[PDB]
Design a protein around this motif. Sequence first.
Motif, short mmCIF file in Angstrom:
data_model
loop_
_atom_site.label_atom_id
_atom_site.label_comp_id
_atom_site.label_asym_id
_atom_site.label_seq_id
_atom_site.Cartn_x
_atom_site.Cartn_y
_atom_site.Cartn_z
N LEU A 82 0.80 -1.22 0.00
CA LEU A 82 0.00 0.00 0.00
C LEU A 82 0.84 1.28 0.00
O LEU A 82 0.30 2.37 0.25
N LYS A 119 -2.55 4.68 -11.33
CA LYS A 119 -1.61 5.28 -10.40
C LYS A 119 -2.25 5.43 -9.04
O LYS A 119 -3.46 5.71 -8.92
N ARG A 120 -1.44 5.28 -8.00
CA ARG A 120 -1.93 5.52 -6.64
C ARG A 120 -2.37 6.98 -6.56
O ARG A 120 -1.64 7.88 -6.99
N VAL A 178 -7.44 4.46 -5.91
CA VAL A 178 -6.36 3.48 -6.00
C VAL A 178 -5.36 3.71 -4.85
O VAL A 178 -4.79 4.80 -4.72
N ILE A 179 -5.16 2.68 -4.04
CA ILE A 179 -4.25 2.76 -2.89
C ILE A 179 -3.06 1.78 -2.99
O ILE A 179 -2.14 1.84 -2.17
N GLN A 180 -3.08 0.89 -3.99
CA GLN A 180 -1.93 0.02 -4.23
C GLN A 180 -0.72 0.83 -4.71
O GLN A 180 -0.87 1.86 -5.38
N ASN A 181 0.49 0.38 -4.36
CA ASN A 181 1.72 1.00 -4.86
C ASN A 181 1.81 0.95 -6.38
O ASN A 181 1.20 0.08 -7.02
N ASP A 182 2.60 1.84 -6.96
CA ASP A 182 2.65 1.95 -8.42
C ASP A 182 3.41 0.85 -9.14
O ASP A 182 3.26 0.69 -10.35
N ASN A 189 0.69 -1.52 -9.46
CA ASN A 189 -0.24 -0.97 -10.44
C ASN A 189 0.22 -1.16 -11.88
O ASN A 189 -0.61 -1.24 -12.79
#
Lengths: 115, 115
Positions: free
Chosen positions: A112, B5-6, B30-34, B37
Amino acid sequence: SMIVKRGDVYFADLSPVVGSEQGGVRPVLVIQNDIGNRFSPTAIVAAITAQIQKAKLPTHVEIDAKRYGFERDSVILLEQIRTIDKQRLTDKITHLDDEMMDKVDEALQISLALI
Amino acid sequence: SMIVKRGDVYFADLSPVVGSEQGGVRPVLVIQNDIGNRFSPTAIVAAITAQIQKAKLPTHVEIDAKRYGFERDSVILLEQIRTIDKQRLTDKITHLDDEMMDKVDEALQISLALI
RNA sequence: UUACAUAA
Ligand code: NA
């Protein structure tokens, strides 16, 4: 609703899903804080799989089945997380120790971008 | 799979759902890292709602619609997370600035007991 | 032409 605790592993039915989402009945790890776990109808969980036994990504944490009470060696996918209503839960499998949960926390932070 | 993109906010249909899992078509953040992503077919997101009349939990972050270009004042529900296939994502609304994402990070740390 | 619930 039933009370659960962060660190608990339960079977949960995650179906139905779309595309590359993780579905089916599988073990899941409770990663929501315990205040939400007490008061909310929902928990937040990470999917567990046995299709791999070794971590591929820094968002993966391996579970040794014999040590932690699983049927087979598994991996926690901290890139596959979701809020579920507690009614999806069935049987409690185990509760993971601090050594494991410290690894889970690091994987979650990477997943995250909280690092 | 498409690059997201986060910080991006897209519409997505989160249905079907069970119980109090946040349902329906709505904006998601979107909260996942790039890195995830870019390389994964799934994105980790948090649900957004326009019901600003509900009591503000520590996992809630308010969005001022005039400042951020939303249709109405909204709330990001960091207790309502989904990992979804990118095919669920439809229209892009906007990208949230660092001031907003710092608040999201704090709420996410509370949600997942990473404080 | 785009919820409910949940923090002594
Ligand atoms: Na159940």
